[PDB]
Design a protein around this nucleic acid. Structure first.
Ligand SMILES: [Mg+2]
Ligand SMILES: [Mg+2]
Length: 222
DNA sequence: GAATCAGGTGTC
C-alpha cells in the first residue's frame, strides 16, 4: 500500500536498503529494487531465515529490476561508514537499468542522487525496501562466504565479519587483514604500526588509507 | 519468530 501511494504520486519508485553497516570486515552492500509483480512473503530481511531469504531472492531476481552497489573497506575507512553507505546506495541506483523517479530509502537522513524519502523501519513499511533488504543481505553473505575461501583461518561464512567472539579470537590469533575496517575501534586496538607499514609496503593498502589509519593509530588510547 | 545476551558507527 505504502509503495502504491508513492507509485501513483511519483511514478517509478525503487526501494533501497543496505547490509553490512556494523561489520568489522568487508564492504557495505546496498540494493535498489523496482518490482511490479507480487512476491508473497516479502518482509524485512531480519525476520526471515537464511533459507527463506534464499528462495525469496530467487523470485525477486525473476520478477524485479535490481541494482547492487558496494563500497569497499578502503572507502569506509576514508569516508566513514555513513558516507560509504550512501555511496553504495548511489552505486545500486546506477546499476539499476530501470531508472526510478523516486526512491524509498530504509532509515533516516539519507539523500541519494535521486529524490526520495527515508523511512524509519522502512524494511517493513514497504515491500520495495523489504525486497532490497533481502537482496543486499544475501548478496553480501555470499561475498563473505567467499572471503572464507580466501582467508581459511576466518569463519567469514558464519559471522559475516561481525564482531563476534570467534571473529575477535580469529583476529588476535591470525592478525588483522586489509579487508578489515581499520578505522573501526576493535580492529584499530589490535592493529600495530608494524603491521600497518607492512600492509603499505606489500601494496596491500593505498597510501591515502595508510596515512589516515597511521594517524588514527597515533591518536589511539587517548 | 522472540528474547536476551553480545558487539560495530553514523546523525543531530
Ligand atoms: Mg538491511
Ligand atoms: Mg530496521
Amino acid at each position: 500500500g505504502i509503495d502504491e501511494l508513492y507509485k501513483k504520486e511519483f511514478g517509478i519508485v525503487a526501494g533501497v536498503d543496505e547490509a553490512g553497516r556494523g561489520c568489522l570486515a568487508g564492504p557495505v552492500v546496498a540494493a535498489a529494487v523496482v518490482l511490479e509483480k507480487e512476491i508473497e512473503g516479502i518482509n524485512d530481511s531480519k525476520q526471515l531465515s537464511p533459507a527463506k531469504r534464499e528462495r525469496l531472492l530467487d523470485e525477486i531476481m525473476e520478477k524485479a529490476a535490481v541494482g547492487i552497489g558496494i563500497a569497499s573497506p578502503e572507502e569506509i575507512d576514508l569516508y566513514n561508514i555513513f558516507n560509504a553507505t550512501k555511496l553504495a546506495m548511489n552505486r545500486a541506483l546506477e546499476n539499476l537499468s530501470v531508472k526510478p523517479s523516486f526512491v524509498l530509502v530504509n532509515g533516516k537522513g539519507i539523500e541519494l542522487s535521486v529524490p526520495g524519502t527515508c523511512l524509519v523501519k522502512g524494511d517493513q513499511k514497504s515491500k520495495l525496501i523489504g525486497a532490497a533488504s533481502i537482496v543486499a543481505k544475501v548478496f553480501r553473505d555470499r561475498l563473505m562466504s567467499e572471503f572464507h575461501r580466501m582467508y581459511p583461518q576466518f569463519s567469514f561464512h558464519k559471522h559475516k565479519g561481525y564482531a563476534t567472539k570467534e571473529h575477535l579470537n580469529e583476529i588476535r590469533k591470525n592478525g588483522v587483514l586489509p579487508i578489515h575496517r581499520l578505522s573501526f575501534e576493535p580492529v584499530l586496538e589490535l592493529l600495530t604500526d608494524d603491521l600497518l607499514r607492512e600492509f603499505f609496503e606489500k601494496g596491500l593498502i593505498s597510501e591515502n588509507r595508510f596515512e589516515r589509519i597511521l594517524n588514527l593509530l597515533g591518536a589511539r588510547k587517548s
